[PDB]
Hints:
It is classed as transferase/dna. By secondary structure, the protein is α+β, with helices and mostly antiparallel strands. The chain has helices spanning 11-18, 48-51, 61-67, 78-93, 118-136, 148-158, 168-177, 188-195, 204-207, 210-229, 258-276, 308-325; strands at residues 3-8, 28-32, 42-46, 72-75, 99-103, 106-110, 140-145, 163-165, 244-255, 281-290, 295-301, 330-340. The protein folds into 4 domains: 2-10 and 78-166, 2-Layer Sandwich (Alpha-Beta Plaits), CATH 3.30.70; 11-77, MutS, DNA mismatch repair protein, domain I; 167-233, Orthogonal Bundle (DNA polymerase, domain 1), CATH 1.10.150.20; 244-336, Dna Ligase, domain 1. It contains 12 helices and 12 strands. The protein has a 5-stranded mixed beta sheet. The chain has a 4-stranded antiparallel beta sheet with strand order 9-12-10-11, with helices on one face. The protein has a 3-stranded mixed beta sheet with strand order 3-2-4, with helices on both faces. Helix 6 links the parallel strand 7 (140-145) and strand 8 (163-165). Bound molecules: 2'-deoxyguanosine-5'-triphosphate, 2-aminofluorene (AF) and calcium ion (CA) (3 copies). It binds a DNA duplex through residues 32-35, 38, 44, 78, 102-103, 106, 184-190, 218-221, 240, 242-250, 283, 285, 287, 289, 295-301, 332, 334, 336.
Amino acid sequence: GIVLFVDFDYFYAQVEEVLNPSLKGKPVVVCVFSGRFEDSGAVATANYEARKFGVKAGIPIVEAKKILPNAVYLPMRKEVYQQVSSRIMNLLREYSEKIEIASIDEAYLDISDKVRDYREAYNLGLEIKNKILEKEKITVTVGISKNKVFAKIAADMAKPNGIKVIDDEEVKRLIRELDIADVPGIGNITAEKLKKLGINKLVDTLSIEFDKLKGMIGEAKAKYLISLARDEYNEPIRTRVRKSIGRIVTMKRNSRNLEEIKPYLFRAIEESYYKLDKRIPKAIHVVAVTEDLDIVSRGRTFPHGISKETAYSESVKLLQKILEEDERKIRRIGVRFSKFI
DNA sequence: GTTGGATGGTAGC
DNA sequence: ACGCTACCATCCAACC
Ligand SMILES: Nc1nc2c(ncn2[C@H]2C[C@H](O)[C@@H](COP(=O)(O)OP(=O)(O)OP(=O)(O)O)O2)c(=O)[nH]1
Ligand SMILES: *Nc1ccc2c(c1)Cc1ccccc1-2
Ligand SMILES: [Ca+2]
Ligand SMILES: [Ca+2]
Ligand SMILES: [Ca+2]
């Protein structure tokens, strides 16, 4: 079995470069008015002409400007990047029908029935990289291996404008050689739980007994890491389907006043209910982001679908429930809909 | 105590 | 990403 993972290089900035080639060779930074940094926003993506100097995703814009004060700072236009992406996914479909859209710029492909071995796979990659650049003028990185996870690590090693195959041997090498942290699904929090307890490779997970690993990172991550180290990881390429649609809005000032908050909450409903686009949810959750930036939520599932009026009415009840059960002022209010009929 | 689903949260991306 | 998925401990209703 063979998996090909495509990852679009610095996607949003790249798209902006395409929609405006004058920007090529200039440092380009795509900004978001993101969580922590509600003064000047944060870097969503930067091109390599900006990354070279350390301007990377998630750093505050106030810090970017200290590095590249003459760079181009662009508002992020997600709707544009979504279109372009979908056109690329279509191009990927013409190579394999078995595809898994992991995110706006990431897709897995099962190419087992398209190639005979890794030599031929590399060339398909080259063809794919060639097609995207041709049709969308976007450099992408291609990762090829025997499974999704390793295909992904491959692309991580070759970023940007790269291509890599991790053969069956190197897979065995990486199970012994690679830092556990660089495995997909392992972030800062989980790695601490592993680095503290002497687990730095995948192979280390075969040593430790299952229950103490379960009661530390969970049944899922445990089975997942065991499976990888044991070289038995065999997860099929499946179609992802949207499972929830939500929206969060920031208020002018922190509050606990229901009448002051209601309008922002209704804004969230209108906007997320519009997005449902013919889908009928059975669950509704209201989130509050509090003044200290902690996240709280109250939801309900119905034996039937939620009409926009039920959404309005239940929402108020859910936000009342938050207001009774949490003493903190609220900074952001939001809603999400799930369990579609 | 068990089973299925629901809840409010964690973690990663 | 102020958006989303998967997961988890716990809760809940109902129970031969
Ligand atoms: N809407 C939104 N998308 C974001 C934000 N930050 C990052 N993203 C998107 C753009 C990126 O493709 C991706 C960031 O994490 P990734 O590691 O998956 O990006 P990746 O290394 O694959 O390449 P990319 O960052 O272009 O260079 O998610 C944000 O604040 N808001
Ligand atoms: N980005 C984002 C948007 C909406 C929501 C989250 C993240 C988490 C959450 C939880 C409950 C309702 C809505 C949201
Ligand atoms: Ca990317
Ligand atoms: Ca990405
Ligand atoms: Ca990691």
